[PDB]
């Protein structure tokens, strides 16, 4: 078991002896080891970068050199490892390349959901998007890099090969509301189409972290899908506050997070089901949630509820690794 910790991607290895996670000394590490670890995480042949950095994880024991426990690293640095170029965008209608991970998911020539690109082949969305009668992958088309719904027509999108819902998804409560779509062909990345980064353990997000949502969702409660892609600012809302008797009264589980503004009609309706809730940290854009439930957008004391992607990242890695 291997993972990347925190916003500086500190490579950590689990120690069965100590039953705890520990950073890798830069000592004798190289790109082949980094690629091996990336493969082990499910990123296949992707590899972005690896460099030594000062350990900002707090740890007190490290893995050196084949790896063994060491109280110190001779190079006094630990491995920072990025398996894919992600979390980059351009630099209230959205500009081309502003939200390049945003996709629109269609059935029967109709926008049904949103999603987020995480690899050339994999999209994060909501499990309730692909609830029957929409569980057949052949029903779906993904449109990437296109801002206007009217330019999302037959031939302009990408066929979907696989739909995988979280195995503990509960449609009754919308608990664990996350799913993966695998495309039949890999996307070509450019200025307009790029992935968002999956969140790492230890993001240490602030209680009311500033986030963004994007999508083609209706602005007006009684309305149709927006023709053009929109985006908006939202603040995270602490789950204990979201679970107030005047908000969602204990419907928010550990697999959910709340975002928006409690007070006033701020019209946070731009998001689509399954679409991204992202935040910028360490100059990287991270996928913190996927839009799940809460129809009363633009309403006081009814913020958006999102699948908590941080707790689903291990499942996502497992699925990506299992493919093939």
């Amino acid at each position, epitope marked *: 078991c291997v993972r990347l910790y925190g916003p500086n991607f500190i490579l950590q290895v689990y120690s069965s002896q100590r039953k705890s996670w520990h950073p890798v000394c830069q000592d004798d590490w190289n790109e082949n080891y980094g690629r091996a670890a990336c493969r082990d995480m499910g990123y296949k042949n992707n590899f972005y970068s690896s460099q030594g950095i000062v350990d900002d994880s707090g740890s007190t024991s490290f893995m050196k050199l084949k790896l063994y426990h060491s109280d110190a690293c001779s190079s006094k640095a630990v491995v920072s490892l990025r398996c894919i170029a992600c979390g980059v965008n351009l630099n209230e209608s959205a500009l081309p390349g502003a939200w390049p991970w945003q996709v629109s998911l269609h*059935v029967q020539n*109709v*926008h*049904v*959901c949103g999603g987020s690109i995480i690899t050339p082949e994999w999209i994060v969305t*909501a499990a*309730h*998007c692909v*609830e*029957k*009668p*929409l569980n057949n992958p052949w029903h779906w088309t993904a449109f990437a890099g296109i801002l206007r719904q009217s330019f999302m027509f037959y031939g302009a999108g990408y066929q979907v090969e696989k739909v995988i819902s979280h195995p503990n998804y*509960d*449609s*009754k*409560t*919308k608990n664990n*509301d996350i799913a993966l779509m695998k495309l039949q062909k890999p996307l070509t990345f450019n200025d307009l189409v790029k992935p968002v980064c999956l969140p790492n353990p230890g993001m240490m997000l602030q209680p009311e972290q500033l986030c963004w949502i994007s999508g083609w*969702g209706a602005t007006e*409660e*009684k309305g149709k*899908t927006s023709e053009v892609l929109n985006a908006a600012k939202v603040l995270l809302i602490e789950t204990q506050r979201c679970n107030s008797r005047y908000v*969602y*009264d*204990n*419907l928010i589980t550990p697999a959910m997070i709340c975002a928006g503004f409690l007070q006033g009609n701020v019209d946070s309706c731009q*998001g*689509d*089901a*399954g679409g991204p809730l992202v935040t910028s940290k360490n100059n990287i854009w991270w996928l913190i949630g996927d*839009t*799940s*439930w*809460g*129809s*009363g957008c633009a309403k006081a004391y009814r913020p958006g509820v999102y699948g908590n992607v941080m707790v689903f990242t291990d499942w996502i890695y497992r699925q990506m690794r299992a493919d093939g």
Partner: nanobody
Amino acid sequence: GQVQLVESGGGLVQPGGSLRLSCTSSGSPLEHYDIIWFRQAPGREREGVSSITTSGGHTNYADSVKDRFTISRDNAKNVVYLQMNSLKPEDTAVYYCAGRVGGRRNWIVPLDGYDNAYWGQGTQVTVSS
């Protein structure tokens, strides 16, 4: 709290008549839930007849009730309604509401979704002369 659905409005009516069933909730406001009205008569299988999303923007009807039944909701009043016109002896059954926390996808709620849902206690509807 966990939602508790309560149906009412049933009773005896003549063929051709109308009834308006309604469903409310305790424990948790009804506005959060997608709602399916389904029915069951003794000896027959359960039958979803109508469904509606939390926002009311997608409704769905069984062929057997289309044009005669109309589902609607009033979130401020915490209620979901089923208007049943031109009633028929074959519409006799206990009518139940089934609820799920409602999602945001732009699609109908399937009529067979009562298999994993909160359920009310049902309200008897009898159509006879």
